[PDB]
Write a protein that binds this ligand. Structure first.
Ligand SMILES: Nc1ncnc2c1ncn2[C@@H]1O[C@H](COP(=O)(O)OP(=O)(O)O)[C@@H](O)[C@H]1O
Ligand SMILES: Nc1ncnc2c1ncn2[C@@H]1O[C@H](COP(=O)(O)OP(=O)(O)O)[C@@H](O)[C@H]1O
Ligand SMILES: Nc1ncnc2c1ncn2[C@@H]1O[C@H](COP(=O)(O)OP(=O)(O)O)[C@@H](O)[C@H]1O
Ligand SMILES: Nc1ncnc2c1ncn2[C@@H]1O[C@H](COP(=O)(O)OP(=O)(O)O)[C@@H](O)[C@H]1O
Ligand SMILES: Nc1ncnc2c1ncn2[C@@H]1O[C@H](COP(=O)(O)OP(=O)(O)O)[C@@H](O)[C@H]1O
Ligand SMILES: [Mg+2]
Ligand SMILES: [Mg+2]
Ligand SMILES: [Mg+2]
Ligand SMILES: [Mg+2]
Ligand SMILES: [Mg+2]
Lengths: 367, 367, 367, 367, 367
């Protein structure tokens, strides 16, 4: 019987069988629709394109993320990505497998209740479960205690966890993520003269971000590099063949995580949110949380994140105590690994919500 | 066969085999229950935590003393601590050993009668005994005559004892103790800005009390120290990493024993209770009691107690006569030592209440 | 001109005009002082509270009996009660009236000599007299011969009196009384779990004593009632709203009068003191004393006293002769009635000590 | 000469002349600072905005409460609000008027001593006084006896008061208040999809709380209303023009006062704190306190508070006795009314601390 | 001394003295170069033609806009237009006057830094300033708050402005403008048979656009007019003498602003950009922005723009709130009027960048 683990974050769907080391199908959550009405006979006609296929044909298509800041914006688009994910990648009837789904904490009740309704009614699933991302990441680490910072494309979380358990009143979500940083890198990029207006080009600048951008230890040093131009300016090649040269924009893109005042948000940077999250927790456990702070997600991948963290949190907190930050490689797939490992635990099998227990007990029993 | 000596006071259980120099198992009488409902699979689940284990995880748990001012408040919690004490620390079937238990004087009949009922029915014990604390302390001193002041966490006693015998009409109990002094140090502590609201934090301030607080010879000198801040302010470190600095609060916490008007009680300080206890005794024996006044318990541990005693009692009593105060080191375990030594005496073995003599004669035969 | 009769016993002042059937002002001899220093503007400020007024506000005030076992402990407190008694209740300048005061027999010379000094110097009195309580009670009975047992709050007396006259060598005082019995009912009460530590609460347990407690004919029957719980347990309501249930404590409180070994006194019970008092008297008169034994005071009010007396004295004395005990209702005010009737006798008017005869003859002429 | 009464609580400053029925100037204690650096010439420039003015321009400004849980967090911000309060609203030189200031009980000594230092040195005041809030509320009621529950934005108190006087050992403070309830209504609000992240939006949700939220008699009935959606969902309009519909969130916001476990605090609800406060008081006075329990402050304004109180306290306390709760309309201004009435009393004029008596006697004489 | 205000947008240079009601010199930013090499002696020879002069001789000359979408494409052409603007129209040595220059927001840093370098080095200017267009338009309106839509020939902006200040993260630029609409009217025009291939003819079709084209309230009504040909077809005369008749092309040219899908751009129309700009602003201020939305520039001149705006924005936004659109006549010169009024303000004179402060501080100090 096994199980399917489906990590539905904005920007990437990671899906695959439980008990395995990595997800098999990893593709973007995009639903491409042709921008220009096309006059051929034979072509497509392909009214809708989905996932990596939409990535193949960006210059025709208007790309549309169905999921924004963790919240599902357009339901039938979502449904398309799931249907494509199941039959065209994993090759599987959902009626043969319980399915573990993922979601951000502190997220509107509509996402659980509609999600579950889709999975039972539209696909037919013998049982399923929807879990909090950060707990899955924490299982992937191999640890029971720690404060998780999960930064994906839609959303960034802090979830403190002590000896199992959890602290819901210290959970802190923040909308800063790969999508905000890509748009911020758009408008900062345009100051060199490089104009990326369209959805398709957004995905190009996502690529630039993913390769080139790094997090400076001290911002001022980056400013000095911008002042004298040596290793900081790097050449990147577009798909067209043009050459972009980016200097300070390389490192002032991800500086937004520490200084959200660059986007015009009053929310304190990710270091003050993690420290703030530690503050709201009981005086006893803070030492462990400081020692054990875990990183997950695509927007933790920027070289130089962990070191700046271990500067900034060490400047906020009392010096007397050790702040080890644990950011393991293969952290982008931490949530999916944790969904896998959780599905392979036998003590979890009682917790699946059954197709039957759903029809009789309602939508109210997902929580 | 030997025997088990179990010293059940509020705050600490001291237990071990008779005929030995110290108790082996010494842990707090706390029953931790998780405050926040924890979402993991595998964790615990550990609906109840007990003793030192509850101390390990204070920031999750709501700590609950099962015993308050010597009186047993919650019976099944007590039972848990005993069951944990026997099988998880002393490693012993109670059916192999007579068991000597302890209790404060002047204490409601419900504690003897329910206690004994638990020990015979729930654990099965071949015989047991429940003794008055101060008499046990007096055996530990190696002496037959003296007036015992036993200050534990729940309660403070004076028991005058002359040439063996006892004087029940001069026995005086007083609810001032480590628990009242910890709460008083809470609210006085909050005047520096340090806010300790929770049960877990109470145990932190118990730790502060145990290390830092001392009893001033004269209160006025302490006030002068508070006025010019030199040795009186000491730094203490929390488990978090924060630094607390406490000046006059160091010595005005235990001043409450001499001035219970700080808690709003009309009861005269411990020096006027000991002197008052001496007054109610026959004119013949007072000289011995004054010479031989013994100290026991955790709340006698504050540096500077004995000297202030030997000031204050010397100011109450007629000057013509010697007031020696005997406070031996290792006095916190005086009651347990006295239970040990008593269990090793052969002339005491007739006085055990037998499982058989209990079933036939009733609950009324504990007294 | 008339006269003032002032019955100053510990616990209650009974005062009023002579020639009248009862005292008008009857209130407790207490001097209330605020325990907690009060921050308002307007309140009181009322540094001292006295009498029934102090009874109105017990939970603020520390109550202090100025008179202990008949002996005056604190003089300026006494003075306060008298000054309040005169101007705030009887509404009278003491310079208009001779004043008859009361005192226990066998009582230190300081009480007569200081009392008289206060009445002449501080209040100004044209003449006064201080009388032995039991003689006043005997006048109240309407009889010339008898042995009086007067049990008040401070003290219990036996005074044998034959055909007028008196026998000073058979007068026997004993410190057992409402105050000792209230404290004894405190510590016996605490065995149900009911903890009354404070002066204010003492007055609550005085109330319990006054309503509920009775004197058992045979103690053993009371023990049997304690064994099977039927009419012996009665509900009493505190001022708070809590419910106290008291079983054997109802009747073993006043059993202390017959068995002072409950307080740890060697003094023989009130029945052996009355019998002993009869023994020290001349062989001729004993028959009358046995026939005519009179009761007075608040601590004679317990239902069942007279019958137990007429058991116990009948078991001590030779059976051949009638022991009638005379305990009239309205016996609590026997001493005050006797002071009234004595002040109305014309043959007594020569015996007043004049303000003038005092200044010239000294303090030595009170005796 | 008159006097100024200044009620400085977190969230609202109530100030005005003494002897008057209401405060004239009532505005929020906020210090607005522009978030985005503004490029105009002429604008403002207005580096700091204060009070109602900051409320006019929330979308530009970062709002900052200078006072948190009664404790002053940022001193120069405070100073700004006072300076604005005096010259821009009351129109008055402080050198013409003694000034009565307010503060929460049990509050760090730094607030009195720095406050007083500011008022004498920075403004110059001929004399001033700093009073405990609950006593002022109690004067406003027109009563001398009662237990005050004062819930403002920073903090909630219970202060029992008997016949004037006070009981400091029964005073109980609790950090639950309009500020905690607003943040709790934030995160519960976000489950409908309504995302309020910023300080400015916090003040919008404060407005929602103030209009719509009520306290349920029984929580379960509220749950039933949430289950079938009829009168419980109400429409509220934002300043933008969007429509928010809130159902169960209306009444489960203020349920936090009775169940602080919703915020993750172990502190017992406001009903168990008031009952607990009654318990620590002397047995004599509890009946009055139960009869006379007074309410004050903005966080007592929720419709349905008094009735739930008179359910819950009646379930804790012994049924035999009347629990009247007195919550007068115009209770939000109870503290300020009480400061007024106190300043108009002539017997209070001796208690002002003089500018002179301050310079000579120190900062230590505020207490 | 006064000042020069130079509004350099693509298509028209508006220049003149500050403190005046309109610009004196208004001519096209074109640099004409002869297409055919001309064989005469005496003619010209006039290797370069500039401005209105180039307009006089279009059929010989290749017209070349030096500035494209706000970005300066060819620097020495620009320089020519400035040099012609100064000496041949305004008649002025730039060394006598500070000069205020204009530029679009979000525009590459090269334009500020090179512009300033030209003005100081090539012309010599005692001081200058480069301002954001929309702020200048907002000063021209006489208002401090509003969201400006500035549509010129190169570029269209939305800049929201609140109470002075600004919101850089909500500023949105869009390349749709008179130049794109003229080319779109070219290719749509060619469907009647009218072939305009050349740069010179582009300026003819710009003229057609400026006179004849209007913005339809509803596009469908325009389609109906196209269907039955009555008032919608209008005759226009070319400079040659030929007659063009244009029906639906009159109104479907400017429909491109609302539907950029006509040019093949995915960018949402000007109504969704203005609404989107309102969305990114803080919830507090949106109402003002909706009330106060301002129009500026040549591509706002089409009759019927404001009404379609006040349809379309009213269909996007919540109906409950008033959307007034302010489009004043003489709005084409709004930016220049605002530059004038700003130069006449004395509080702005500190903000001029001095020739001296430039040489010492660098090119980096323009920002
Ligand atoms: N190597 C990288 N360097 C920096 N940013 C990255 C990198 N890889 C991806 N990202 C960013 O992180 C996002 C993917 O993170 P992911 O954890 O997969 O999000 P989610 O799980 O919510 O889909 C992308 O949208 C991208 O912007
Ligand atoms: N070193 C110390 N200094 C002062 N107080 C102490 C110290 N050790 C413990 N105590 C206090 O005394 C208590 C323990 O006394 P103990 O005699 O063990 O009580 P019990 O026998 O009733 O458990 C603690 O609760 C603590 O508050
Ligand atoms: N009805 C009663 N039942 C039993 N005890 C009583 C009763 N009335 C009062 N007493 C006790 O007797 C005392 C009062 O006796 P009283 O003769 O007035 O003493 P005195 O004359 O010395 O003041 C009280 O203190 C109380 O304890
Ligand atoms: N009508 C109301 N309904 C419920 N809550 C209110 C209402 N009015 C104000 N409050 C809450 O109470 C607070 C104001 O109380 P207040 O007594 O003025 O506090 P303080 O005196 O400490 O400033 C506000 O912060 C708000 O959250
Ligand atoms: N009366 C009009 N009707 C419609 N379009 C016009 C009209 N006047 C000029 N325009 C268009 O607007 C442009 C000029 O706008 P302007 O604000 O002067 O741009 P900029 O300030 O960027 O030079 C021209 O290129 C033309 O296409
Ligand atoms: Mg993720
Ligand atoms: Mg002990
Ligand atoms: Mg008497
Ligand atoms: Mg208040
Ligand atoms: Mg323009």
């Amino acid at each position: 019987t096994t199980a399917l683990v489906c990590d539905n974050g904005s920007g990437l769907v990671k899906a695959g069988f439980a008990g395995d080391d990595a997800p098999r199908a990893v593709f973007p959550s995009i639903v491409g629709r042709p921008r220009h009405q096309g006059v051929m006979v034979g072509m497509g006609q392909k009214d809708s394109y989905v996932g990596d296929e939409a990535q193949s044909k960006r210059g025709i298509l208007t790309l549309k993320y169905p999921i924004e800041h963790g919240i599902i914006t357009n339901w039938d688009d979502m449904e398309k990505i799931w249907h494509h994910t199941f039959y065209n990648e994993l090759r599987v009837a959902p009626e043969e497998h319980p399915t573990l789904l993922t979601e951000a904490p502190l997220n509107p009740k509509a996402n659980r209740e509609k999600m579950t309704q889709i999975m039972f009614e539209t696909f037919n699933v013998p049982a399923m479960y929807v879990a909090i991302q950060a707990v899955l990441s924490l299982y992937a680490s191999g640890r029971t205690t720690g404060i998780v910072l999960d930064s994906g494309d839609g959303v960034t979380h802090n979830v403190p966890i002590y000896e199992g358990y959890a602290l819901p009143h210290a959970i802190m979500r923040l909308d800063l993520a790969g999508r905000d940083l890509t748009d911020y890198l758009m408008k900062i990029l345009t100051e060199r003269g490089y104009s990326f207006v369209t959805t398709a080009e957004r995905e190009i600048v996502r690529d630039i971000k993913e390769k080139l951008c790094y997090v400076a230890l001290d911002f001022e040093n980056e400013m000095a590099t911008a002042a004298s131009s040596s290793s900081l300016e790097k050449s990147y090649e577009l798909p067209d063949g043009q050459v972009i040269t980016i200097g300070n924009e390389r490192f002032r893109c991800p500086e937004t995580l520490f200084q959200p005042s660059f986007i015009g948000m009053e929310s304190a940077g990710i270091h003050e949110t993690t420290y703030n999250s530690i503050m709201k927790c009981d005086i006893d456990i803070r030492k462990d949380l400081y020692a054990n702070n875990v990183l997950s997600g695509g927007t933790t991948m920027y070289p130089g994140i962990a070191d700046r963290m271990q500067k900034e949190i060490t400047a906020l907190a009392p010096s007397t105590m050790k702040i080890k930050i644990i950011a393991p490689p293969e952290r982008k797939y931490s949530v999916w690994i944790g969904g896998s490992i959780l599905a392979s635990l036998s003590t979890f099998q009682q917790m699946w919500i059954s197709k039957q227990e759903y029809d009789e007990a309602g939508p109210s029993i997902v929580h």
